Design an enzyme around this catalytic site. Structure first.
Site, PDB file in Angstrom:
ATOM      1  N   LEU A  13       9.323   2.879   5.127  1.00 16.62           N
ATOM      2  CA  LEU A  13       8.837   2.047   4.794  1.00 16.62           C
ATOM      3  C   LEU A  13       9.648   0.874   5.208  1.00 16.62           C
ATOM      4  CD1 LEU A  13       8.464   3.089   0.969  1.00 16.62           C
ATOM      5  CD2 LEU A  13       6.733   2.637   2.579  1.00 16.62           C
ATOM      6  N   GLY A  14      10.583   1.392   5.895  1.00 16.14           N
ATOM      7  CA  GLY A  14      11.811   0.633   6.840  1.00 16.14           C
ATOM      8  C   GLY A  14      13.384   0.633   6.658  1.00 16.14           C
ATOM      9  N   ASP A 111      20.501 -12.954  -1.696  1.00 16.30           N
ATOM     10  CA  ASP A 111      19.932 -12.874  -0.680  1.00 16.30           C
ATOM     11  C   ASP A 111      18.332 -12.675  -0.507  1.00 16.30           C
ATOM     12  OD1 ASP A 111      19.523 -12.469   2.198  1.00 16.30           O
ATOM     13  OD2 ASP A 111      19.416 -10.292   1.993  1.00 16.30           O
TER      14      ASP A 111
HETATM   15  C1  LIG Z   1       3.039  -1.128   1.201  1.00 24.17           C
HETATM   16  O1  LIG Z   1       3.951  -0.707   2.324  1.00 24.17           O
HETATM   17  C2  LIG Z   1       5.363  -0.890   2.673  1.00 24.17           C
HETATM   18  C3  LIG Z   1       5.676  -0.466   0.826  1.00 24.17           C
HETATM   19  C4  LIG Z   1       7.632  -0.637   0.793  1.00 24.17           C
HETATM   20  C5  LIG Z   1       7.682  -0.700   1.754  1.00 24.17           C
HETATM   21  C6  LIG Z   1       7.575  -1.907   2.722  1.00 24.17           C
HETATM   22  C7  LIG Z   1       5.889  -1.500   2.994  1.00 24.17           C
HETATM   23  O2  LIG Z   1       5.487  -1.879   3.979  1.00 24.17           O
HETATM   24  C8  LIG Z   1       5.627  -1.133   5.252  1.00 24.17           C
HETATM   25  C9  LIG Z   1       5.729  -3.087   6.287  1.00 24.17           C
HETATM   26  C10 LIG Z   1       4.230  -2.368   7.101  1.00 24.17           C
HETATM   27  N1  LIG Z   1       4.075  -4.259   7.962  1.00 24.17           N
HETATM   28  C11 LIG Z   1       2.593  -3.953   8.385  1.00 24.17           C
HETATM   29  C12 LIG Z   1       2.244  -5.097   9.150  1.00 24.17           C
HETATM   30  O3  LIG Z   1       3.564  -5.997   9.278  1.00 24.17           O
HETATM   31  C13 LIG Z   1       4.344  -4.948  10.132  1.00 24.17           C
HETATM   32  C14 LIG Z   1       4.904  -4.614   8.873  1.00 24.17           C
HETATM   33  C15 LIG Z   1       9.509  -1.157   1.405  1.00 24.17           C
HETATM   34  C16 LIG Z   1       9.170  -0.822  -0.447  1.00 24.17           C
HETATM   35  C17 LIG Z   1      10.376  -0.628  -1.244  1.00 24.17           C
HETATM   36  C18 LIG Z   1      11.854  -0.792  -1.582  1.00 24.17           C
HETATM   37  C19 LIG Z   1      12.531  -0.483  -2.946  1.00 24.17           C
HETATM   38  C20 LIG Z   1      13.680  -0.888  -3.542  1.00 24.17           C
HETATM   39  C21 LIG Z   1      14.309  -1.025  -2.128  1.00 24.17           C
HETATM   40  C22 LIG Z   1      16.303  -1.440  -2.111  1.00 24.17           C
HETATM   41  N2  LIG Z   1      16.727  -1.598  -2.078  1.00 24.17           N
HETATM   42  C23 LIG Z   1      13.881  -1.293  -0.203  1.00 24.17           C
HETATM   43  C24 LIG Z   1      12.308  -1.268  -0.562  1.00 24.17           C
HETATM   44  N3  LIG Z   1       9.319  -0.202  -2.617  1.00 24.17           N
HETATM   45  N4  LIG Z   1       8.502   0.018  -1.932  1.00 24.17           N
HETATM   46  C25 LIG Z   1       8.174  -0.923  -0.183  1.00 24.17           C
END
Ligand SMILES: COc1cc2c(cc1OCCCN1CCOCC1)Cc1c(-c3ccc(C#N)cc3)n[nH]c1-2
Length: 252
Positions: A13-14, A111
């Site tokens: 997810l990152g 942040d």
């Molecule tokens: C449903 O998609 C996602 C869900 C989530 C995240 C990124 C997500 O998206 C990924 C990025 C995809 N993009 C597509 C278009 O552009 C490029 C990037 C990050 C994330 C988190 C999260 C929860 C807690 C923390 C902490 N500390 C950090 C992250 N919970 N749920 C999600």
């Protein structure tokens, strides 16, 4: 019930953040894989609010947090465009509810930015990542901050000019920059310094320039009160809740 403790990591997810799915229930959680970690877990254990990412526990450190299927607010912002004003207002209301909650329990995020603002299945904004967060009020006594934290386009000018500063106006400023990004799809400056021409233009009220030219006069009047250089003169959240655009009924 057997196997309810088994989680399958299905995608990134990152450290890193991975989407984990329960083997039995198919429940989805976000797993953060990592002095600073101990404080992050401690701050996360205090949190319980509808506009704050849920913390389920910890077990290399594995932090188990809420999965937000709507992803990041960052990906809802169209470059140089922004998003419809009613969406930005609803997200800004939800951001203020989250920030009021944190400030009320004496926590400053430090942040606030669209990468750290997540959306659940119903597009409810959730404040995430407390890795830079700190306690600014304890035993009803306020502690002034001095540490350099945050992301330069979102940091308040006092963090670069003063040795010590109040925590709450710093988070209010970052929220005004998030609001700018949602309504114009661009950040107004690299950093809030007099050497920065875009920052100097704003203090000179040159709102005929970008990003301000793209923003309606009612939310722009709110931004004039948030993006105030002196943090002692900057609008507080109770007064943001009384702002005309904040209370303007909007529909697409
Ligand atoms: C449903 O998609 C996602 C869900 C989530 C995240 C990124 C997500 O998206 C990924 C990025 C995809 N993009 C597509 C278009 O552009 C490029 C990037 C990050 C994330 C988190 C999260 C929860 C807690 C923390 C902490 N500390 C950090 C992250 N919970 N749920 C999600």
């Amino acid at each position: 019930v057997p196997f309810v403790e088994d989680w399958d990591l299905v995608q990134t997810l990152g450290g890193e953040v991975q989407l984990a799915v329960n083997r039995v229930t198919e429940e989805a959680v976000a797993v953060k894989i990592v002095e600073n970690i101990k404080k992050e877990i401690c701050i996360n254990k205090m949190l319980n609010h509808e506009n704050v990412v849920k913390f389920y526990g910890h077990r290399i450190q594995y932090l188990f947090l809420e999965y937000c299927s709507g992803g990041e607010l960052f990906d809802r912002i169209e470059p140089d465009i922004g998003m419809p004003e009613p969406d930005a207002q609803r997200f800004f209301h939800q951001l203020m509810a989250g920030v009021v909650y944190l400030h009320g329990i004496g926590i400053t995020h430090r942040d606030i930015k669209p990468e750290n603002l997540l959306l659940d299945e119903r597009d409810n904004l959730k404040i995430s990542d407390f890795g830079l967060a700190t306690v600014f009020r304890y035993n009803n006594r306020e502690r002034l901050l001095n540490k350099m934290c945050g992301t330069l386009p979102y940091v308040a000018p006092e963090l670069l000019k003063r040795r010590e500063f109040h925590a709450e106006p710093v988070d209010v400023w970052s929220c005004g920059i998030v609001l700018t990004a949602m309504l114009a799809g661009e950040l107004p400056w690299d950093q809030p310094s007099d050497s920065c021409q875009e920052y100097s233009d704003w203090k000179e009220k040159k709102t005929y320039l970008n990003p301000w030219k793209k923003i309606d006069s009612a939310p722009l009047a709110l931004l004039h009160k948030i993006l105030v250089e002196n943090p002692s003169a900057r609008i507080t959240i109770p007064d943001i809740k009384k702002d005309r655009w904040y209370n303007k009924p909007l529909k697409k």
